[PDB]
């Protein structure tokens, strides 16, 4: 059905995403059990990590488009990512490595993430109809990799330890690199412009120098989230001043404020929703025992099923508003299940968490799939910078919000933790509902401005 390089790109993406979510699904639990962080410390550190992983995505597009070529940068990003996964597995021998290793993952992901997408865009004549089909199967690839990692990684860490989990993450990356290097001929005429002139070693050295610098700055900021807070605050207020100085752009600003709320909510799945499933949900579904941390797999799962269907079936403004209403309903379902549908011992049915993750995943399909692809319909380089800046801020604020559900290591009664989760999830849902009602009100004016 699809060109041959499509399958190569599909599987490089699948494997890289397996490594990434292999780390993401265990990281907060690893901060708590392995490094003996408290839950509040684990949550804010995860917030900083996520923020950097997302903020540095801007780099890899520029580096692939203009410095080294798309395919060279796929290779380089795979290599730096694998180094980072093995460094994280080495952190267990050498604990002081942890932040450097996470910085290596962030920078690695930054160089890599934008680039398979680019390459797949260049596998099709410019107005080939199969482009949308192919991009939905690419998102399904991302989400199959994420499904498998979020399901199996916690099981592996429990049965074999973390060094083995992180080394498998590296091995996934190494076989992504091997399948790329094997299928390299399939993409010999595909690439950006630097891909086809000889490689400039001056530029490669600037990229390696700057990568190393950023690894160290990442490690510093995740160790010291209070200066990360101020760096991002001042960066935000300054870039807001310079956006206001220089109204399709104003509609883009309102849409980014909406995406910020979405990412604060998205940030909860590996933190507060994760620990809610650990503390106040039954670890058994359909008669099978599961690792509760595996519950995160419910987000890619629902994506994998809902993306074909929803591709079968207002425009951008309503789709953003719809997605916000969905996210609101996910957190209101979580609060409801805690307030009224709980066992005398303080535990709830995992079907409520299946439904929470459905609502969340649908909000993701409506917003983050459908955002910068058509924020680019409203615009440039400065607003991509401001986008990635503000979404990294979103993830930092997400970690701070998650800390409202933090439980001290010495509480052991689920009836003590259940009111905390339900208060926070209920207020998150009420605020997101208000935000969505304002979005709905603004849909007509916004829809005029897009004309």
């Amino acid at each position, epitope marked *: 059905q699809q060109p041959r390089p499509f399958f190569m790109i599909f599987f490089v993406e699948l494997w890289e995403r397996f490594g990434y979510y292999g780390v993401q699904g265990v990281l907060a639990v690893f901060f708590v059990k392995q490094l003996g962080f408290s839950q509040e410390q684990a949550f804010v550190t995860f917030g900083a990590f996520a923020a950097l992983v997302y903020g540095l995505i801007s780099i890899g597009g520029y580096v692939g488009d203009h410095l080294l070529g798309t395919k060279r940068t796929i290779v380089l990003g795979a290599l730096v990512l694998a180094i980072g996964y093995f460094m994280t597995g080495m952190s267990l021998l050498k604990p002081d490595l942890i932040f450097i290793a996470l910085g290596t993952i962030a920078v690695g992901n930054g160089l890599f993430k934008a680039n398979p997408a680019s390459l797949l865009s260049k596998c099709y004549p410019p107005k080939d109809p199969r482009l949308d089909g192919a991009f939905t199967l690419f998102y399904m690839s991302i989400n199959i990799g994420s499904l498998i990692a979020l399901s199996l990684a916690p099981v592996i860490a429990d*049965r074999f330890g973390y060094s083995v989990t992180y080394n498998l993450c590296g091995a996934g990356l190494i076989i992504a690199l091997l399948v790329y290097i094997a299928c390299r001929g399939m993409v010999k005429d595909i690439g950006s412009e630097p891909d086809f002139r000889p490689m400039s070693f001056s530029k490669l050295l600037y990229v390696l120098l700057g990568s190393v610098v950023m690894i160290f700055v990442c490690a510093w900021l995740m160790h010291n989230v209070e200066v990360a807070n101020l760096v991002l605050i001042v960066l935000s207020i300054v870039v807001t001043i310079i956006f206001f100085r220089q109204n399709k752009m104003f509609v883009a600003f309102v849409l980014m404020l909406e995406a910020v709320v979405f990412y604060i909510l998205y940030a909860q799945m590996p933190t507060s929703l994760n620990f809610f499933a650990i503390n106040n949900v039954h670890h058994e579904i359909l008669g099978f025992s599961i690792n509760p941390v595996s519950f995160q797999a419910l987000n890619p799962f629902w994506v994998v099923l809902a993306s074909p269907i929803l591709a079968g079936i207002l425009s951008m403004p309503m789709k953003f508003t719809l997605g916000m209403f969905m996210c609101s309903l996910g957190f209101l379902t979580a609060a409801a299940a805690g307030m009224w549908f709980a*066992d005398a011992q303080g535990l709830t049915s995992p079907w409520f968490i299946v439904l929470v993750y459905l609502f969340q995943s649908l909000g993701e399909l409506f917003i983050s799939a459908l955002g910068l692809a058509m924020i680019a319909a409203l615009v440039m380089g400065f607003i991509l910078g401001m986008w990635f800046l503000t979404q990294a801020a979103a993830f930092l604020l997400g970690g701070y919000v998650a800390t409202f559900t933090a439980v001290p290591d010495n509480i052991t009664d689920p009836l003590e*933790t259940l009111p905390v989760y339900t208060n926070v999830f209920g207020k998150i849902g009420l605020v997101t509902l208000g935000v969505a009602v304002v979005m709905l009100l603004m849909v007509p004016w916004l829809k005029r401005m897009i004309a």
Partner: nanobody
Amino acid sequence: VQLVESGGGLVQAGGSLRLSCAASGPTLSNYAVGWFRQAPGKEREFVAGINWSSGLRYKDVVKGRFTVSRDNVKDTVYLQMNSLKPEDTAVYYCAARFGGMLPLQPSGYANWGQGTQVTVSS
């Protein structure tokens, strides 16, 4: 996923026993281990437990007499029972649940030992 209990037996009122629970496969380190007991003709009740980060929970009638502790090198959890009384006679089970919580009913726990008889004579 399967836990082995050792250490029960027969003891006179005022004596002491020590039970121990170990797991085969998963590291009990990630687990809240609770100890339940069933006396003849009653239901399993929660006795005493430790979570994955050393928080402890105790049924009121064993406070001051039983101690749960955890050896994270040997990957074993212990229940030290002192000042034993005849009303402590029961089948004792260990049970493991992932996480920091120790719920009170048996349905909160997925992994169960087979049981050790503990008898306390007058």
